[PDB]
Write a protein that binds this ligand. Structure first.
Ligand SMILES: Nc1ncnc2c1ncn2[C@@H]1O[C@H](CSCC[C@H](N)C(=O)O)[C@@H](O)[C@H]1O
Lengths: 265, 265
């Protein structure tokens, strides 16, 4: 009679919380989706071994179109767990799944776990200073989307940081790299010329947040666009004007050039 | 000789990630602070019992003024852990402690945990639509803080949601409720008269996130300002322009008045 939304965390199978692991172990059925994101630091096998339960993977369609035909029926007479990378209900469409549960007379509880939204604090940037968030998407055929550019503009002009998720084709495990994101933004800057993203723009790259050895780099596009940040996933951030303390952290921890202490503060 | 910043999570001892627990168990010395937030679901005991070590709790003073005198010295020849509520680097100034660690020649690692910052997802409001965040601070003597009122105005003008962290004075066992925050806001609205926060403003209250039964309520200030949301911690959210599915979740899951289902686009 109960459905548990459980977050798996940031990077590997140990990123789940003690609460989520113990509850998952007690569940009769366990589902998981890896289309909204991927636990790049682990495997389904390791997650399964860690929980000691068979895990049925669901596709985007399984969830969005048939959640009530696949997951909810079993929840009416058993304890069911639905695992997702990061923190549950962060992905835009997941919150409404709880409405579906209610409509089916199924009670649901949420078990939180680390999310990149909060994990980016490791970059040293003050969390309250983040503005609207966006996703950098690959252009396709005749479609060249650019809203993520306007988002950066709207945030920066108010002294706010912009968290940029990079395009992912999880089914094919194809990651957009920070380098590609920068190249794309420079291209968008070249058509719109709003003085938002240039070679002089300061940016921060966060790779493999959650692992014990993440890659935290800060600097100007002209020096980072060709730098190697390692394996995905990559997260890009275009900071607004920095507080001296933020800049000192980027310099001491993220290897940013001393120049930011006078140019971006 | 390493220092670990480990988050304990939102509500109780089980909100710590498995990664954090396994590392905490193998540390020689364990420190912690409980002034940056309130974990109303646990005690130090369960944490110590869970970790198997004795934990020395530090005051804001011990940390902000003597961290390099109390903690760092030990990390020079031992593996030390510093525990904090939620995620250690979210809405705290703990990130600066990593700089001190560096300057003292001590390597530090960050182990994330579920944070109130990403838990807002359980309110049904799209997390990417959150703009700048702010804190409703206790007025002290003649000093009456108000900047948080401007943040709401700025976000609302852009149709973005506003996350309002609530003040806390751990040494005085004072934890600001969503009610107290609403009163302070009406007072600020009374003197600024910007039509930003009134009896007709729609707000959302999230109390004790992380617990299995958090209080999630949405409605007009006039109706919620006198409502009992249970024990702290509490956060207050002032939504911006609502998407249809956000409104439906608020109504179906947070008990908001059906009339908010009607969105004026
Ligand atoms: N479980 C919870 N429920 C509601 N509000 C919470 C909360 N945990 C923290 N807060 C809010 O945030 C304030 C502490 S700010 C420190 C936040 C912490 N590092 C984190 O990652 O969550 C509290 O005064 C309260 O307003």
């Amino acid at each position: 009679m109960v459905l548990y939304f459980i977050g798996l965390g940031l990077y590997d199978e140990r990123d789940i919380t003690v609460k989520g692991l113990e509850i998952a172990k007690k569940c009769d059925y366990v589902f998981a989706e890896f289309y909204t994101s991927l636990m790049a630091g682990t495997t389904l096998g390791r997650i399964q071994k860690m929980i000691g339960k068979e895990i049925r993977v669901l596709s985007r369609e399984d969830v969005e179109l048939n959640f009530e035909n696949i997951v909810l029926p079993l929840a009416k007479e058993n304890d069911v767990a639905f695992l997702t990378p990061g923190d549950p209900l962060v992905a835009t469409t997941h919150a409404e799944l709880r409405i579906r549960a209610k409509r089916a007379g199924v009670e649901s509880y949420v078990i939180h776990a680390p999310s990149i939204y909060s994990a980016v604090g490791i970059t040293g940037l003050h969390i309250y200073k983040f503005g609207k968030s966006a996703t950098v998407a690959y252009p396709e055929g005749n479609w060249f989307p650019t809203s993520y550019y306007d988002v950066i503009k709207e945030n920066a002009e108010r002294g706010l940081h912009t968290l940029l998720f990079l395009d992912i084709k999880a089914e094919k495990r194809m990651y957009m790299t920070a380098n590609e994101a920068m190249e794309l933004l420079l291209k968008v800057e070249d058509m719109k010329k709003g003085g938002v993203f240039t070679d002089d723009t300061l940016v921060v790259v966060l790779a493999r947040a959650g692992s014990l050895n993440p890659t935290i780099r800060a600097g100007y596009v002209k020096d980072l666009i060709r730098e190697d940040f390692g394996d995905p996933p990559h997260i890009l951030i275009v900071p607004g004007k920095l507080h001296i303390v933020e800049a000192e952290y980027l310099v001491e921890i993220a290897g940013a050039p001393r120049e930011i202490l006078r140019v971006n503060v």
